[PDB]
Amino acid sequence: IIGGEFTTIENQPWFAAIYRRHRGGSVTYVCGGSLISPCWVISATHCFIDYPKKEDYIVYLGRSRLNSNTQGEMKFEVENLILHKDYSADTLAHHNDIALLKIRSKEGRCAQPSRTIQTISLPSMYNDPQFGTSCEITGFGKENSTDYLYPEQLKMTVVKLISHRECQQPHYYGSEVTTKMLCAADPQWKTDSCQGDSGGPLVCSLQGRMTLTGIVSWGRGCALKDKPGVYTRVSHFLPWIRSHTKE
Ligand SMILES: *C(=O)[C@H](CCCNC(=N)N)NC(=O)[C@H](C)NC(=O)[C@@H](CO)NC(=O)OCC(C)C
C-alpha cells in the first residue's frame, strides 16, 4: 500500500495472509485474501497460477504482522485451491482474476470467529456502490515502487471508485478495462495498492453494510497519475462463487 496508514487486524478482521512454503524452510508472502465464510477465503488467480499445488500454501487469519506472531492468530492448510478456468493475462489486463481457497486447520476445523477473525459480506447480484464512493484497501504490499521489501505491519488506505466511462478514457486504460473490472484511485494520486497487495480486499460501505466489492488485481505501476488500481468486480462473479463453494 502506497501511502495510507498502519492498521491492526482488529480493524480488518476478514483479512487473510497467504504464504507459500519452499524447498527447505523458507516461507514467503504471496498475496492477501478475504474470509467470506468460516471455510472459504477469496483471492486472485494470478497469485497461484504458476504454482497450483494446494499443499505449498499456508493461510493465516488474525495476523497483523508479516513475519511475527499476533495473539489470537490461526494457521490453516489449503484443502482445495479453486482457480478460474477463464483466467488470462494480456499486456496490462488480467481477466477473471479470482480464486477460492478452502481452508482447514490441522485438526480439520474451519475458522472460529473472534475479535480478530470475522467474515466479510458478499455483494448482491449486480449491485455496486455509486461511482465516487470511498472504499478501503488493505495489505502487506510495497509502500513505495522502488522498495523490494514489504512492510512488517499491515497497512490500509482509502480510494474512490472511478466510473467505467472514465477508466476507459485513452489516457487511462482504454478498452483494456472491462465491465468485470472496477477502477479505484486517490483523487490526488497519492495512495494506491501495489505489488504485494494482490488478492486483497477492496471494501465498500454498501447501504450501511461492509461489503467485499473488489479484489486487488492489477494496474500500470503504483499511484501513477491517470492510472487507477484495477480490481476484480466481485458482484459479477456471484454465480461462479456459489457454484464452487457448495460441495
Ligand atoms: C499484485 O500482484 C499486483 C497488484 C498491483 C496493483 N497496482 C495498482 N493498484 N496500481 N498485481 C500485479 O502485479 C499484476 C499481476 N500485474 C500488474 O499489475 C502489471 C501488469 O498490469 N503492472 C505492472 O505495473 O507491473 C510491472 C511490475 C512493477 C514489474
CATH of residue 43's domain is 2.40.10.10
Q: Let me know if 235 is a catalytic residue.
A: no
**Alpha helices (H) along 98-237:** 164-167
Atom index in ligand 1 nearest the CA of residue 218 equals 18
> What region does 197 belong to: left with phi over 0, alpha with psi -120 to 50, or beta?
alpha
Q: Are 137 and 205 in contact (CB under 8 A)?
A: no
**Could you tell me if 218 and 145 lie in one domain?**
yes
Experimental technique behind these coordinates: X-ray
Q: Please list the residues that pair with 94 across neighbouring strands.
A: 89
Listed in sequence order, the residues at least 6 apart from 22 whose beta carbon sits closer than 8 Å to its beta carbon are 28, 56
**Could you tell me if 132 and 230 lie in one domain?**
yes
User: Per the residue annotation, which of 34, 43, 193, 198 is the catalytic one?
Assistant: 198
**Could you tell me if 80 and 141 lie in one domain?**
no
CA of 220 to the centre of ligand 1 (A): 6
DSSP β-ladder status, 40-43 and 57-61: unpaired
**Could you tell me if 127 and 156 lie in one domain?**
yes
Listed in sequence order, the residues at least 6 apart from 209 whose beta carbon sits closer than 8 Å to its beta carbon are 121
Ligand 1: residues with CB < 6 A are 46, 92, 94, 192-195, 197-198, 216, 218-222, 229
DSSP assignment of the chain, as one string?
A: -BSSEE--GGG-TTEEEEEEE-SSS-EEEEEEEEEEETTEEEE-GGGTTT---GGGEEEEES--BSSS--TT-EEEEEEEEEE-TT-EE-SS-EET--EEEEEE-TTS------SS----BPPPTT--PPTT-EEEEEES--SSTT--S--SB-EEEEEEEE-HHHHTSTTTTGGGS-TTEEEEE-TTS--B--TT-TT-EEEEEETTEEEEEEEEEE-SSSS-TT--EEEEEGGGSHHHHHHHS--
CA of 93 to the centre of ligand 1 (A): 9
Rounded to 5 degrees, φ, ψ at 242 are -60, -45
Which residue segment(s) compose the domain that 82 sits in?
Answer: 13-119+236-247
User: Per the residue annotation, which of 34, 84, 97, 193 is the catalytic one?
Assistant: 97
Helix (H, G, I), strand (E, B) or coil at 122: coil
Q: Let me know if 37 is a catalytic residue.
A: no
C-alpha cell read off for 233: 468486480
Atom index in ligand 1 nearest the CA of residue 223 equals 10
**Could you tell me if 105 and 212 lie in one domain?**
no
CA of 112 to the centre of ligand 1 (A): 33
**Count of structural domains within the chain:** 2
**Could you tell me if 4 and 24 lie in one domain?**
no
**Could you tell me if 89 and 39 lie in one domain?**
yes
C-alpha cell read off for 169: 478514457
Helix (H, G, I), strand (E, B) or coil at 15: strand
Integer angstrom CA distances of residue 51 from 13, 21, 25, 118, 228: 27, 11, 17, 28, 28
CA of 24 to the centre of ligand 1 (A): 28
**Could you tell me if 66 and 48 lie in one domain?**
yes
